[PDB]
Structure formats: structure tokens, C-alpha cells
Design a protein around this ligand. Structure first.
Ligand SMILES: COc1ccc2[nH]cc(CN(C)C)c2c1
Length: 168
């Protein structure tokens, strides 16, 4: 069995744990908890292929800068989930992108753009502009609300598809 190695990163006020737990045990928590290092490993079926995903939830606080630059070339995919309600996290993505490219040492890298809190009428991040920004890198942008769970399953399939395309 192929063990997929990926991590979940994001800014403050995104609610990353809402999306992870939703797929892990189908549960949604409204409470906010700054998960520093929480393991979310589960058997996932991708295209009829049951595999083990080493999913880890990591917080992106400035308190851990050196620790965050310690190692990065040990992950296949970096789940960068932002919130459509947080315009800061949307613009911050550029910084994260630059960081990834710097360490990856390669431009050929499969990535996707998923946004959380799409169930909020308080939209700050425009989908049109997001599409343009995503198309600049060649990555797809999908709105994935954890509360109602809209297009989250399908989004995960596409995320892994690009990784498989990179494999072969
Ligand atoms: C770079 O740190 C990473 C990246 C991806 C990973 N997949 C699995 C692991 C290890 N696991 C114990 C979290 C991991 C670490």
C-alpha cells in the first residue's frame, strides 16, 4: 500500500480542522482550536484504490518560523486552505507559494486552491479574481465549505489526481 504524505497548512481564522475531521470521521466543530500538531490519518479510497494518507494538521503561526524552515522537502502535497471571508489569508497565499517554490526547486508542481467558509454571505475574496490568480500558476480553485460539505469529496479526488499525474 502506498502511503501518501501530505500536510495541511493555513493561516489563523481558517478552520482547517473543520475540513479534516469532516473527511476523517464526518464531523464538524464550530469551536476554534489552534491545532499545533494533530494527526489525522485515515484510509481513503482514491479511484477505487484504498490507500493510507499521512495527513497532519499544522498551524501557520509566525511563532514557528525557524521550525517551519527546518524541513519541507518531505511532503508530496501542501494543503493550503484559505477562507473566502479572510482576504488576508488569500493574499498571504502568495508568500506561502513563494516559500514552496523556493524549497521545491522546481516549477513543475501539482497544486490546487481550495477555499473554506463558502457558506458565509460575508464574502471578501472574489471567486473571479481567485480564478485568475489560480490560473496564473495553472492550479484549479474550488470552494469547499466544511459546514455544509459542498464539493469537498470531489475536490479531494482532484487534489490526488494531480499528484498521481506528477508520479507518472
Ligand atoms: C514536511 O513534513 C512532513 C510533510 C509531509 C508528511 N507526511 C507525513 C509526515 C510525517 N507524519 C508523522 C506527520 C510528513 C511530514
Amino acid at each position: 500500500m502506498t502511503e501518501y504524505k501530505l500536510v495541511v497548512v493555513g493561516a489563523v481564522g481558517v478552520g482547517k480542522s473543520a475540513l479534516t475531521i469532516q473527511l476523517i470521521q464526518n464531523h464538524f466543530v464550530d469551536e476554534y482550536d489552534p491545532t499545533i500538531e494533530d494527526s489525522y490519518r485515515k484510509q481513503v479510497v482514491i479511484d477505487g484504490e484504498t490507500c493510507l494518507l499521512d495527513i497532519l494538521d499544522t498551524a501557520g503561526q509566525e511563532e514557528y518560523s525557524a521550525m517551519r524552515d527546518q524541513y519541507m522537502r518531505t511532503g508530496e502535497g501542501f494543503l493550503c486552505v484559505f477562507a473566502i471571508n479572510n482576504t488576508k489569508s488569500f493574499e498571504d497565499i502568495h508568500h506561502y507559494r513563494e516559500q514552496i517554490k523556493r524549497v521545491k526547486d522546481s516549477e513543475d508542481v501539482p497544486m490546487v486552491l481550495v477555499g473554506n467558509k463558502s457558506d458565509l454571505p460575508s464574502r471578501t475574496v472574489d471567486t473571479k479574481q481567485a480564478q485568475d490568480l489560480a490560473r496564473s500558476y495553472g492550479i484549479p480553485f474550488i470552494e469547499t465549505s466544511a459546514k455544509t460539505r459542498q464539493g469537498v469529496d470531489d475536490a479531494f479526488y482532484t487534489l490526488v489526481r494531480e499528484i498521481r499525474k506528477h508520479k507518472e
